[PDB]
Amino acid sequence: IEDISAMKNGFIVVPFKLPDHKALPASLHFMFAKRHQSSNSNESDCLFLVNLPLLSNIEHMKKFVGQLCGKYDTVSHVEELLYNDEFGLHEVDLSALTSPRNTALLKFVDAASINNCWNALKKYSNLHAKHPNELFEWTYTTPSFTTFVNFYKPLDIDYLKEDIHTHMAIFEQREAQAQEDVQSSIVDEDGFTLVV
Amino acid sequence: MKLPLSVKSILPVGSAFRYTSLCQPVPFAYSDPDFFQDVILEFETSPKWPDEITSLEKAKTAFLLKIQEELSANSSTYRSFFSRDESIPYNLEIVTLNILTPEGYGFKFRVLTERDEILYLRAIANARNELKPELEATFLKFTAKYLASVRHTRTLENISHSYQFYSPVVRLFKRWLDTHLLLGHITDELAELIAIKPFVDPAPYFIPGSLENGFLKVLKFISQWNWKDDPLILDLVKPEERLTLAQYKGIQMNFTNLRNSDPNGTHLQFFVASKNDPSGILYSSGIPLPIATRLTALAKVAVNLLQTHGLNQQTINLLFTPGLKDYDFVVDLRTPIGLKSSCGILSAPSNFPENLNDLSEKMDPTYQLVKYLNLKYKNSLILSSRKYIGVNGGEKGDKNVITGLIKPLFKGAHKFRVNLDCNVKPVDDENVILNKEAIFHEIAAFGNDMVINFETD
Amino acid sequence: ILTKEVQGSTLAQLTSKLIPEVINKEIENATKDIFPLQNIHVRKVKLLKQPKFDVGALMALHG
Amino acid sequence: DWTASILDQAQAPESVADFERLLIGNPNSSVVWMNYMAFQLQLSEIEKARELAERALKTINFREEAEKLNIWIAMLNLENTFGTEETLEEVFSRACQYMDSYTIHTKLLGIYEISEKFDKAAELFKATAKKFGGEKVSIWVSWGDFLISHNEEQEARTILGNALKALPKRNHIEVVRKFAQLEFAKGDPERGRSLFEGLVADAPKRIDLWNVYVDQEVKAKDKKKVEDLFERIITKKITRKQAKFFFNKWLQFEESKTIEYVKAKATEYVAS
């Protein structure tokens, strides 16, 4: 169990020490990493992550990569946490149809960050066998009463109206420039799919 | 009111409009989850409704902005604000209009158009064969939310005059589901239609002229009925519009066609159909199998308990007492604010506060807690709780409990795949098994101050 | 258009639909694709086949 | 037995109620499904096994792409050795419509080779080279493995002129190397030497063409043809660290009399 450093299909095992609680009588969390290979431009220098911890945001990943740079004495900067659909909210695109779970893409600013941080995961993967007390503890952000009752709080009227006017102010003008004939061609193709 | 689009309909579909709200409606008692009653809102049939669902719901939103502008403009005794509706999957732009009267009651307004079903069935036609049953679930919750609830509250409010004892039986039965933590997975209207069969079909017994006889016929019928082999077909009329022979046999053909593809009933357990729901799956899909077998099993423990020890006070006390048995973990919860007085329950809420953000100061954190815990652990865990903490949360109404069951999908080692949706630990470099304790740290750190006790398996 | 309006949620809502003549506008919303129209009203309704007294549901309009 | 061969192409429960509880415990594992399919096949319940394949297409989770790709491999195995051509043309059509169609052709060719229906195979090698040959390299390679194994080297000689006509210019280097590796492994090594000589005369600066052509000759183990080709490398331009890897292959091969001649040459080139 301790000697498991990398998966058969190349996923680096990443342990985490877990915080104690009043109701609970040393456990570890296992997030698995991989280099992401893609021809997509915004999907470059990403780490494909499986089994993310609870409420993992860009800030806790900047903290953890800051701990990795603090330990193995290297340079790496985190750019953007991509595809964090933790509850299943952005899995199915509804708007394109009316017209990969527990994974993420850890986008870095450059290839030196994913090379240095990838080798830092190569060195961090062996600590389950080498030093079980030198692992990094994952500190969960803990929602209080206020965070759960934020979803009972009302919508802000002014930014909603700003979303209406700035939302329609782009699409109504662009689609107003692309009016009838093009949409009649597209729905003509939709009727072409209707017949056969 | 004067609008650019004339209102076609203002149709109430609330439970308190069909008299099934578990708490009776108390003025200014907003802490109850049945406080805001949903109302369907329909405008005139006009081509001003766009061909994209986000701009459609934002058009509904701006229409509710005009309604709020007139309402705050001239009817300032009525208070109002806006909220989101995310219970429909992947339509995050649904905004409900919450209105608080000086009579102390609150309503949420939602808008239904004719462009809706064209866009949803359009989206089903646009979908490839991969994503189709999830859009069947979104369209199914959409149909259960906007379309047949008008005929449901219409029909039950209609024939409710013929069965006067139906309301305390169905409210007490929903409290029985609340005590046994089965209310969170089961929709309310399904429990109404399960609860209506000894009334709409009293034979060979009589129509129940008491709360005791009705609730005992409910528990007896649940303890005797087999959902696997037998359907449930209802005639929702008044005593001497009934179903013909060909329609009854057609619904039985729907049941047999359902049992051709789901013979063990894992995907669909309860088939409760009628004239209002010929499909029988509108309010009964998405519920786990141990909810069904646990409901039938607790029905057999209750009914066989009354066969064994007779009927006295202690047996009725054991009807409403959670045994808390056969669970993988037990989470003991306590909110720091008791809400039994503010839910309007005698053992007084008189006004709404000046700030609407203070209304969240008298809400249920455990409902959002178990809600998002079901949203994240949908593939890995089965999580049950008490929805109405002011009813069954002690003497102050401030304690909850999360009974958690590991699904049989994640009991052993599995091949590691990227779409596993499980918190695992490796047994080798190839296979992984579920990590219980890391999930337990996520639950405790997710419920940092309210988780008081934690029992394991 | 007449049949989709009726057989749901009787005079408590039905006469309440009749008063702001929403149904007459619903006629106008469909008639516009053929030939538009003017004043259209329903002008008359009558009852012939009330089933029974039903005093209890008759007290629902009462406070 | 039947399930591992489906798992071969892709890259104790003893009753009815045994598998049905494991389908509750594992609705997304084709190891559970195909064993319950092979439970019906060994009981000669082919018609019952046809509907179980239809149930698995609607039961297994939809994000499981390669898992559902296993099922269509199992379905094509059903009506090939139990069904007819009219049953085979229905499943294979619907398999190409729902998943990636080119991967369906690569598995169905693999079934005909194992089931030894070579007359139906080469007809299907011909049709897929017509419509996928202008884009895919491996559709000529799978037909390149087919012609050599049945002693049709002259038919496996005209494969390249049809491949160089169909593949673009950036794939012309790839298709010659892959065909000629089948010559040193399965065909005639002299025919493979006539193919790499076109790549040497066209791309001398491409250094890994020299390595593959001496990778296939170490496996050929001919003592005269090794010492010829390794001497023809160093006259071309190789860099500092890359040429030492050529000495790494050339020292250890002669170890497994002429070892002092090859040690006397590995150190003269550092000074000059």
Residue A74 and residue A151 in one domain: no
For residues A13 and A67, membership in a common domain is answered with yes
Using CA atoms, how far apart are residues B385 and B370, in angstroms rounded to an integer?
Answer: 7
B300 in contact with chain C, both atoms CB, cutoff 8 A: no
Q: Do A51 and B424 touch (CB under 8 A)?
A: yes
Contact A94, A126 (CB under 8 A): no
Has residue A188 been placed in a domain? no
A106 within 8 A of A44, measured Cβ to Cβ: no
Question: Are residues A114 and A97 part of one domain?
Answer: no
> Cα(B448)–Cα(C20) distance, rounded to whole angstroms?
56
3-state secondary structure A43-111: CCCEEEEECCCCCCCHHHHHHHHHHHHHHHCCCCCEEEEECCCCCCCCCCCCHHHHCCCCEEEEEECCH
In a mutagenesis test of the A interface, which of B418, B437, B448, B450 is the best target, namely the one with the most A β-carbons within 10 Å?
B418
Interface membership of B417 toward D (CB under 8 Å): yes
Answer whether D touches C (≥3 Cβ pairs < 8 Å): no
Q: Report residue D244: phi and psi, to 5°.
A: -70, -30
* Closest residue of chain C to B11, computed from CA coordinates: C13
Contact B403, B324 (CB under 8 A): yes
Query: What is the extent of the structural domain holding A132?
Result: 110-169
C1: closest chain B residue by CA: B45
Q: In D, residues 49-68, which contact B (CB 8 Å cutoff)? A: 55, 58, 61-64
Q: Do chains A and B touch (3 or more CB pairs under 8 A)?
A: yes
Is residue A190 in a domain? no
**Residues 44-83 in B contacting C (C-alpha not used; CB under 8 Å):** 44-46
Domain boundary among A66, A81, A109: A109
Give Cα separations from D34 to D12, D87, D92, D260 (angstroms): 14, 20, 19, 61
Nearest Cα of chain A lies from the Cα of B445 at a distance, in angstroms, of: 6
Does residue A18 belong to any structural domain of this protein? yes
The token pair at B300 is: 């057999």
C-beta of residue B49 within 8 angstroms of C-beta of residue B361: no
Same domain, A97 and A69: yes
Let me know: does B400 contact B338? Beta carbons within 8 Å. no
A4 and A89 inside one domain: yes
- What residues in D contact B405, CB-CB < 8 Å? none
**A75 plus A117 within the same structural domain:** no
- The answer to whether D36 and D19 are in contact (CB under 8 A) is yes
Domain limit, last residue, from A109, A127, A153: A109
SS3 B320: coil
- Separation CA B198–CA B201 (nearest Å): 5
Closest CA–CA distance from residue B16 to any residue of chain A (Å): 21
CB B423 within 8 A of CB B429: no
Are A96 and A126 in the same domain?
A: no
Instruction: Decide if A33 is inside a domain.
Output: yes
Q: Let me know: does B294 contact B281? Beta carbons within 8 Å.
A: no
Domain count across chain A: 2
CB pairs under 8 A between A and B: 192
| A7, A78: one domain | yes
Burial of residue A72 (number of CB atoms within 10 Å: 0-12, 13-18, 19+):
middle
Give resolution in angstroms.
8.7
In a domain, A1, yes or no: yes
Inside any domain, residue A189: no
Cβ-based contacts of D28 with chain B (< 8 Å): 409
On whether both A80 and A17 belong to a single domain, the answer is: yes
Closest CA to B16 of B4, B29, B5, B6: B29
Tell me if A138 is assigned to some domain. Answer: yes
- Ordered alpha helix ranges (H), B162-243: 166-179, 188-195, 197-200, 211-224
Residue A87: both structure tokens together: 């509850």
Rounded CA-CA distance D37/D48 in Å is: 9
Asked if B130 reaches chain D (Cβ–Cβ under 8 Å), the answer is yes
| Residue A194 domain flag | no
Around Cβ B337, how many Cβ atoms within 10 Å?
14
Please answer yes or no on whether C29 and B44 come within 8 Å at the CB atom.
Answer: yes
Give strand pairing partners of A32: A13, A50
The answer to whether the Cβ–Cβ distance between A140 and B365 falls below 8 Å is no
Q: Is B106 helix (H, G, I), strand (E, B) or coil?
A: strand
Q: Which CATH number goes with the domain that contains A134? A: 6.10.250.2760
Query: Could D26 and B266 be called an inter-chain contact, meaning their C-beta atoms sit closer than 8 Å?
Result: no
Closest CA–CA distance from residue B412 to any residue of chain D (Å): 10
CB D55 within 8 A of CB B261: yes
Other Cβ atoms less than 10 A from the Cβ of D94: the count is 14
B17 φ, ψ (degrees, to nearest 5): -80, -20
How many whole angstroms separate alpha carbon D71 and alpha carbon D7? Answer: 10
Q: Phi and psi at residue A57, in whole multiples of 5°?
A: -115, -170
Q: How far apart are CA D146 and CA D129, in angstroms?
A: 13
Determined by cryo-EM
Which run of H or E residues covers position B9? strand B7-12
Residue A92 and residue B357: Cβ atoms within 8 Å?
no
Quick one: A121 and A61 in the same domain?
A: no
List B residues 279-308 in contact with D (Cβ-Cβ < 8 A). Answer: 289
Closest approach of A18 to chain B, Cα-based (Å): 7
The two structure tokens encoding residue B437: 């304790």
CA angle, B16 as apex, B15 and B21 as ends, to 5°?
A: 70
First to last CA, chain A: 57
Sign of the torsion formed by the C-alpha atoms of A64, A70, A72 and A77: positive
Phi, psi of B9 (to 5 degrees): -150, 145
Q: Is A9 in the same domain as A71?
A: yes
Do A84 and A114 lie in a common domain? Answer: no
Under a CB-based contact definition with an 8 Å cutoff, are residues B348 and B368 in contact?
no
Residue of D nearest to B379 (CA): D61
- In angstroms, the first-to-last Cα distance of chain D is 62
Q: Which residues have CB under 8 Å from D250's CB, separation 6+?
A: D230, D262
- Chain B CB within 8 Å of residue D18 CB: no
Name chain D contacts of B289, Cβ cutoff 8 Å: 24
For each of the domains in chain B, give its residue range(s) and CATH number, in order of start: 1-324 (no CATH), 325-457 (3.30.70.3030)
Domain boundary among A77, A109, A141: A109
**SS3 at position D196:** helix
